[PDB]
């Protein structure tokens with residue numbers, strides 16, 4: 001199965017910047033969500049989970065088909081809580097019914113990262129909705145209770161290498177774990193709706209204790225009130241990951257650049273872009289537009 005990007009008919013950069021802007025304005029407006037964290041983090045996670053079902057071996061799953069809209073995928077236990085991101089995007093889709101679902105879910109993530117003062121993420125249009133029977137089964141998203149070997153092997157299926165994995169994990173600066181949603185509780189840091197390299201700094205610099213939470217799962221906790229999942233912590237247990245964590249803790253621009261590449265790649269896995277497709281778009285933030 002080849003998934004060829006097909007530009008929504010007649011649309012160009014300005015159309016998608018209008019969608020960007022509507023997402024960004026609603027992100028600003030709907031600020032109460034999740035104890036005033038706002039929807040940025042869950043939109044980033046929605047983009048990732050709708051992309052991260054991809055299997056490089058047979059091109060099943062991935063962002064192209066926008067299959068999260070079907071009940072098997074929106075009810076994946078691994079996706080618990082993402083319905084909030086979907087509901088956020090609903091009025092956006094109603095205003096711009098021409099955008100594909102995959103394009104909207106992925107654009108939500110780009111918009112969230114950028115509006116949270118993260119790197120620019122080039123974004124390409126052209127995902128096309130595919131039917132219900134193309135929805136990937138549950139179980140393709142990763143477990144959190146595992147070690148570095150798990151993480152490394154997991155991400156090979158998404159064609160990500162060590163640097164790409166450690167960069168992508170930096171998105172765990174954002175938002176928080178919610179006990180009822182996954183069995184883990186707590187934020188990873190203080191700046192959880194501003195995109196920074198704090199995840200790496202906290203991994204290296206907090207004093208972590210291995211504790212059990214109220215769902216009887218182990219997680220790493222600090223006196224500052226932060227947590228790390230076992231898979232996060234694996235990034236400093238494994239010496240290869242550790243080196244990269246230290247790099248990003250010590251170079252914010254490098255983290256931004258590597259995250260941007262890896263996140264675009266994640267959002268584009270499985271899609272074939274014709275030779276004459278438009279170049280990737282780089283959207284202006286609301287701030288850059290004076291909006």
Ligand code: HEM
Pocket residue numbers: 041042044045048081142143144145151168169171172174175176177178179181182183184229231263
């Ligand atoms: C080994 C890989 C990963 C594992 C096991 C993992 C696991 C988790 C878990 C358990 C949660 C908490 C869900 C909840 O209780 O609300 C979470 C939240 C989150 N993850 Fe991941 N994650 C991984 C990779 C990633 C990647 C690659 C990204 C995106 C680049 C990402 C972005 C997020 C965001 C932004 C949140 C916060 C969501 C919110 O506040 O609502 N994660 N992750």
